[PDB]
Paper text:
[name] virus ([name]) belongs to the Hantaviridae family of the order Bunyavirales, a large and diverse order of segmented negative-strand RNA viruses (sNSVs) containing several emerging pathogens. The multifunctional ~250 kDa L protein of hantaviruses, amongst other functional domains, harbors the RNA-dependent RNA polymerase (RdRp) and an endonuclease and catalyzes transcription as well as replication of the viral RNA genome, making it a promising therapeutic target. The key player in hantavirus replication is the large multifunctional L protein which, together with the nucleoprotein N and viral RNA, forms viral ribonucleoprotein complexes (RNPs). The endonuclease and cap-binding functions are required for viral transcription initiation via cap-snatching to provide short, capped RNA primers derived from host cell mRNAs.
We established an expression and purification protocol, allowing us to obtain highly stable [name] L protein with the endonuclease active site mutation K124A from insect cells. Applying PEGylation, we succeeded to improve grid preparation in lower-salt conditions of the L protein in complex with the 5′ RNA 1–18. Single-particle reconstruction yielded a map at 3.2 Å resolution, comprising parts of the endonuclease linker, the core lobe and vRNA binding lobe (vRBL), the RdRp core with the fingers, palm and thumb domains as well as the bridge, thumb ring and lid domains. No density was visible for the N- and C-terminal regions containing the endonuclease and, presumably, a CBD, respectively. This suggests that these regions are highly flexible in the 5′ RNA-bound conformation of the L protein, as previously reported for other bunyavirus L proteins. The viral 5′ RNA is bound in a pocket formed by the vRBL, core-lobe and fingers domains. Nucleotides 2–12 of the 18mer RNA are visible in the map and form a hook-like conformation stabilized by three base pair interactions between A2 and U12, G3 and C11, and U4 and A10. Protein-RNA contacts between the 5′ hook and [name] L include the side chains of Q388, Y525, and K559 from the vRBL, N290, L403, R567, K617, M618, K619, and K654 from the core lobe, N737 from the fingers domain as well as M1031 and V1038 from the finger node. The fingers domain spans residues 735–920 and 983–1058 and contains the fingertips (residues 884–894) and finger node (1021–48 with missing density for residues 1032 and 1033) insertions that are conserved among sNSVs and the Bunyavirales, respectively. Both insertions were well defined in the map and the loop connecting the two short α-helices of the finger node appears to stabilize the bound 5′ promoter RNA.
Author numbering: 225 to 389, 401 to 435, 450 to 675, 700 to 927, 931 to 974, 978 to 1031, 1034 to 1097, 1100 to 1179, ...
RNA sequence: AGUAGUAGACU
């Protein structure tokens, strides 16, 4: 293992005095501070000046458009729908619709569908409402739930419905008339979802009786609650109809005693990409979600009025969004509840609480892109007007770069404008959705964060957001080429000098860097690295540059990689693992990272861009690169990671909130003392110490060639420079980058060149690829960039110390985002002796004391920003704030304090589950709620989320009396059923937060076993029989539910190899051939290829419609149902009769807040036992740090197992089973200010926080 | 007609 000798980077040993002289000249100049001061008049004026020049940008519209995705009403307290009530209500409703005289085509097709339903035969009405086992296809009813109407039986208007498959219009928001109208409409809706319709572990539950009273017992009565339970029914019917074989037919369902009818039209199925399900409703006008201007019509039928809504078309995303809408609104309102009680100190009153619930529900039902964009902008507008200086001018200017199509948008504009003006005018903090003033700032921003998270990800239009991601890369590449044809290639790759600045031919733009600044920044970082030479030499060795490639985890993953160039002109799209198996089938060795770089470097760095599907209003990047690109980036990030481990001010490679708040605490500690100065004559001038947080924010405009001169000048504590020159040669190869436009866009552009399309097509010069230079490629160089930023800030600190040595200032930072702290110095007294000192310095040559007389922190920021710009870093003038109190870093609101939003974690427990069974999804959903308990959510919220997500799962599978309700079959009570047999979850939060998830199963088994060992009773034998049936087919079994190189090894070969080499169940092979076999065994695993062939995560959650009755459980080599698995379970458990196998498996036994850590190699030891032949032992030795303490530590572990359990691993059956026990042995916890990192002081905090208003001692 | 958009789409 030798590194070849690459060419080093030429250097030019700079002088700090030259750049100090430049900075002195730069400070005696005219520089205006880029952030404006925040005044109420300036904010009102910005709203006026944007509002007046507004309507000339768009065309005025005549009516506000649609925003409700479904309309409906309720006669009273809703009762959910069974199959019998569906049939009777459908007959009632189609009798009522046949009395209509049709006019508008919706009425025509509703009358036709109802007529054909009332022609249905006596024996088809049976097969309409029939389970899909006894079902049998008849004349008009081919699927259960559908019928078959035909287009020869249709009124001429109905075929018009079937066949109906420059500036934008916008409501004038500058007009008080239209603002009053849209506000009146939305207040009518929101006022209508609040009417009191009327109602239809023991410690935690007694307190939860107090939360359930003050929350659920008030919100259980409202109209919004029952309408949410109704939308759930309508969406269950739509999801049923959206399958493949069903969607090609018609349907009619009815709800609420025949008060709401749902007509579903034939449509293309939702299993395929880009399809819709069209439908409409017919309903009695009354209490509901009604928007009367987007109803199709209203008729009068024997006195009562009926609303016919429009024909809606919905995608698969918004359908699941509306299916979970009740749960989302309820979870977000309970979140609001906790924040309010924490803030004010008691429970909210029922009037504001009901209005909050209704607002959340309306947002959950709209689900439009244009409202998501509004809340996206609002979370930036809120800190920009409560800060001292900020860029609110440009933010409010971007708030107006949209049309306001519907009426909910104009209503949102009004309430947002009022909130922003009232925030700038003024602690005191007005809420947005109620009439509540807050105390702390965190409550108000948390409210807007909660409203932003109610919107699903990916609401953007596909072919219009897929073109908007290529645009940024193309236009920054145009900028770079402009600079290259103006300055020449050498100044682009090498940088300018300070003499070029002051001659005046180069200016400090953004895609250009300074030679002196880069090298002197490296020199400051070097002065921090020269100290810890030992640890720095020992980190560069522990990255292992001679461990072979492909034998790391990351190089054999599931992450997507480009492949070889096709025929159409694009790249392939394989997976990391496929290209790992593809290289090894001609490599002939398993080479290491330097020898793969030496192997694959004549190829250029291809890349491709693929949407991240975020919720923010402009969707971002994510690149997919080839293998040679991934090699070079591996080399560079490994080097820079080893170096950046020992630098405290770099926060990428580095449990972030702990270190952040240590930095804040240090900085607040500096401003306790009081600096002062003695003058020439001996005047003693006293000063104060202030702080000024600059929450910075920002990167495609950034030359990647500054890193070469930064890398070559870094001290690393090595005996030579053969690795450094290889890192430089790797960086010299990521300069240029071929960029490929995706197939979707290339097709789309050909399905139609205006003006903005034609220049974009001229960039690619009539191909699919074009070269970019000096590109960052999203996060593929993050450790580099954050170390470079921290270096430049250190350079600034020393330069400020050497311009004003008299003044004992301060400085600190944090480069994830970024948070700079400036410890400036206030003259304290009112007397002019400070101004006289500034005079006495300003005549005596020191002209640069001109920028320090007044304000002064502005000059710290100006010089810091200029040095950062000389290193190509541009601080954003739009989303930066400046205030002497609050701060925001990497999505956490700091105030000195800490506050995580955590609502993302809850709203992810309802949406998106892995789809791997009942047990698997139950565990994932409950693990989300424990994780949200970690981050701020009090025991009762995580309890409510546990209850809700568990109920969602048991209804999504049917194990509740339903299709798979196991208590119909089994002789054990629901308490005693194991989990993976659809049993009761045995669910709590105060146990899952402390123990694990699979403890309760242990309990069930344990109970029977212990009862058995004392009584030999009968149902306990049955519990053991169920557990044995689980083990035949987690610390028990689980029921199983429902690619180029995928069979180079027949399955018997993989089984025989799995027996011959059972050490590899812990350890990745280092040789080639065991690796090729170990990797095909990783393919043929069908959990893995399940995770590859079902990549869009909506499809699997939606195919939980089919996965009910369908043959979806493995049993005896047969896909069967779920009911026959329970049949087989009861059979075996009543025919079972036996202990010590069971014994070896049972014998594993209001203040402000801060952030602590809760805590209750190894795999190489557990491999050392199964080490048998010489190759396997050499693999175990490579896999281990100190490879000769190993045979000691195993013995140390051995008796340790006998220490507290009572087992021997010198029996082979024991050690295969309790390997998870010894994997399992730091979840960060946002806990109050009087908590210590020991787990027994966090567990007391959780118990003390069971009551939100009353005190608890323990 | 719905989703979407100041980039021509889909049912």
């Amino acid at each position: 293992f030798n590194i070849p000798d690459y060419k080093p980077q030429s250097l030019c040993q700079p002088e700090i005095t030259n750049l100090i002289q430049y900075c002195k000249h730069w400070l005696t100049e005219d520089h205006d501070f880029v952030f404006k001061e925040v005044t109420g008049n300036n904010v009102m004026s910005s709203f006026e000046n944007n509002e007046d020049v507004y309507m000339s940008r768009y065309k005025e519209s005549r009516k506000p458009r649609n925003f409700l995705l479904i309309q409906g009403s309720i006669q009273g307290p809703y009762l959910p729908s069974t199959i019998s009530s569906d049939q009777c209500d459908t007959r009632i409703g189609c009798l009522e619709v046949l009395k209509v005289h049709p006019e508008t085509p919706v009425q025509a097709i509703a009358v036709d569908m109802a007529y054909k339903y009332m022609e249905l035969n006596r024996d088809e009405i049976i097969n309409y409402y029939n389970p899909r086992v006894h079902f049998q296809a008849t004349q008009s009813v081919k699927e259960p739930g559908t019928f078959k109407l035909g287009l020869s039986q249709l009124n001429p208007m109905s075929k018009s419905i079937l066949d109906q498959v420059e500036p934008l219009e916008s409501i004038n928001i500058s007009s008080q008339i239209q603002q009053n109208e849209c506000s009146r409409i939305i207040e009518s809706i929101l006022s209508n979802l609040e009417i009191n319709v009327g109602e239809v572990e023991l410690l935690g539950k007694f307190y939860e009786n107090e939360l359930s009273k003050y929350l659920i017992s008030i919100l259980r009565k409202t109209a919004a609650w029952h309408i949410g339970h109704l939308i759930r029914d309508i969406t269950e019917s739509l999801i049923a109809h959206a399958g493949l074989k069903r969607s090609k037919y018609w349907s009619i369902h009815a709800y609420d005693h025949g008060g709401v009818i749902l007509f579903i039209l034939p449509s293309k199925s939702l299993e395929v990409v880009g399809s819709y399900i069209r439908y409409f409703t017919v309903f009695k006008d009354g209490i509901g979600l009604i928007d009367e201007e987007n109803l199709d019509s209203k008729v009068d039928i024997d006195g009562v009025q009926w609303c016919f809504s429009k024909v809606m078309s919905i995608d698969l995303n918004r359908l699941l969004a509306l299916n979970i809408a009740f749960e989302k609104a309820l979870l977000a309102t309970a979140t609001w509840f906790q924040y309010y009680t924490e803030d004010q100190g008691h429970f909210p009153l029922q009037h504001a609480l009901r209005s909050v619930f209704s607002f959340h529900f309306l947002l959950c039902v709209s689900q439009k892109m244009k409202i998501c964009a509004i809340f996206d902008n609002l979370r930036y507008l809120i800190p920009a007007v409560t800060s001292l200086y900020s860029g609110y001018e440009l933010l409010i200017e971007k708030f107006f770069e949209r049309p306001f199509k519907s009426a909910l948008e104009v209503y949102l504009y009004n309430i947002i404008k009022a909130l922003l003006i009232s925030l700038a005018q003024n602690g005191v903090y007005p809420s947005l959705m109620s009439r509540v003033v807050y105390k702390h700032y965190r409550s108000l921003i948390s409210e807007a964060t909660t409203c932003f998270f109610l919107f699903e990800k990916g609401l953007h239009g596909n072919l219009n957001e897929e073109a908007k991601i290529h645009l940024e890369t193309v236009e920054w590449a145009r900028k770079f080429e402009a600079k290259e044809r103006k300055y020449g290639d050498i100044l682009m790759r090498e940088g300018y000098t300070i003499d070029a600045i002051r001659v005046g031919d180069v200016q400090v733009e953004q895609q250009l860097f300074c030679q002196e600044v880069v090298e002197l920044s490296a020199e400051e970082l070097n002065k921090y690295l020269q100290a810890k030479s030992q640890v720095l030499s020992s980190n560069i060795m522990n990255k292992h540059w001679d461990k072979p490639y492909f034998s790391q985890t990351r190089n054999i993953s599931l992450k997507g990689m480009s492949g070889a160039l096709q025929e159409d002109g694009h790249l392939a799209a394989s997976v990391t693992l496929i290209e790992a198996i593809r290289f090894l089938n001609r490599s002939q060795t398993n080479p290491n990272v330097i020898d793969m770089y030496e192997q694959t470097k004549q190829h250029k760095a291809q890349a491709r861009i693929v949407r991240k599907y975020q919720r923010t209003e402009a969707d971002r990047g994510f690149f997919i690169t080839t293998l040679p690109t991934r090699v070079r980036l591996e080399i560079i990030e490994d080097y820079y990671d080893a170096i950046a481990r020992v630098v405290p001010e770099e926060y990428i490679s580095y449990k972030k909130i702990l270190n952040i708040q240590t930095a804040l605490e240090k900085a607040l500690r500096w401003a306790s003392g009081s600096s002062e100065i003695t003058t020439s004559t001996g005047n003693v001038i006293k000063f104060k110490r202030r702080l000024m947080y600059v929450s910075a924010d920002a990167s495609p405009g950034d030359n990647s060639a500054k890193f070469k001169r930064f890398t070559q000048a870094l001290y690393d504590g090595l005996s030579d420079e053969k690795l450094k020159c290889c890192v430089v040669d790797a960086l010299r190869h990521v300069y240029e980058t071929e960029f490929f436009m995706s197939r979707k866009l290339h097709r789309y552009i050909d399905s139609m060149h205006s003006e903005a399309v034609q220049d974009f097509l001229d960039f690619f010069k009539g191909g699919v690829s074009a070269t970019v230079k000096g590109n960052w490629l999203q996060g593929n160089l993050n450790k580099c960039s954050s170390l470079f930023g921290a270096a430049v800030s250190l350079l600034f600190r020393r330069i400020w110390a050497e311009l004003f040595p008299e003044l004992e200032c301060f400085f600190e930072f944090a480069h994830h985002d970024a948070l700079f702290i400036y410890g400036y110095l206030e003259p304290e007294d009112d007397g002019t002796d400070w101004f006289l000192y500034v005079s006495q310095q300003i005549q005596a040559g020191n002209y640069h004391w001109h920028a320090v007389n007044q304000e002064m922190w502005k000059s710290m920021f100006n010089l810091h920003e200029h040095l950062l710009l000389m290193g190509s870093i541009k601080v954003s003038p739009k989303k930066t704030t400046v205030s002497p109190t609050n701060a925001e870093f990497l999505s956490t609101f700091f105030e000195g304090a800490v506050s995580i939003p955590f609502i993302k974690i809850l709203l992810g427990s309802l949406s998106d589950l892995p789809g791997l069974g009942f047990f698997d999804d139950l565990a994932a959903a409950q693990s989300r709620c424990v994780k949200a308990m970690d981050l701020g959510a009090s025991p009762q919220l995580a309890q409510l989320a546990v209850v809700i997500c568990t109920s969602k799962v048991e209804r999504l599978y049917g194990t509740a009396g339903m299709v798979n309700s196991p208590v119909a079959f089994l002789k054990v009570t629901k308490a005693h059923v194991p989990i993976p047999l659809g049993g009761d979850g045995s669910m709590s939060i105060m146990e899952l937060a402390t123990a694990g998830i699979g403890m309760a199963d242990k309990n069930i088994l344990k109970q029977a076993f212990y009862s058995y060992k004392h009584t030999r009773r009968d149902g306990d034998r049955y519990v053991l029989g169920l557990f044995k049936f689980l083990m035949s087919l987690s610390f028990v079994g689980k029921v199983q539910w429902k690619f180029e190189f995928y069979d180079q090894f027949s399955q018997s070969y993989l089984k025989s190899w799995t027996n011959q080499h059972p050490v590899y169940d812990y350890i990745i092979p280092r040789g080639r051939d065991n690796l090729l076999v170990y990797l095909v065994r990783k393919l043929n695993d069908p959990s893995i290829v399940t995770a590859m062939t079902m990549q869009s995560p909506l499809q699997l959650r939606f195919r939980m419609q089919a996965k009910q009755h369908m043959k979806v459980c493995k049993l005896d080599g047969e896909w069967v149902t779920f009911r026959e698995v329970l049949a087989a379970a009861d059979s075996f458990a009543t025919k079972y009769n036996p202990l010590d196998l069971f014994n070896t498996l049972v014998s594993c036994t209001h203040r402000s807040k801060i952030a602590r850590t809760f805590t209750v190699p190894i795999t190489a030891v557990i491999g050392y036992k199964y080490a048998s032949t010489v190759d396997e032992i050499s693999d175990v030795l490579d896999s281990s740090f100190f490879p000769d303490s190993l045979s000691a530590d195993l013995q140390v572990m051995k008796e340790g197992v006998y220490r507290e359990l009572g087992l021997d691993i010198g029996l082979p059956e024991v050690l295969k089973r309790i390997a998870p026990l010894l994997y399992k042995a730091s979840r960060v916890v946002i806990v109050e200010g009087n908590v210590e990192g020991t787990a027994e002081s966090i567990c007391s905090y959780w118990l003390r926080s069971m009551s939100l208003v009353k005190t608890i001692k323990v």
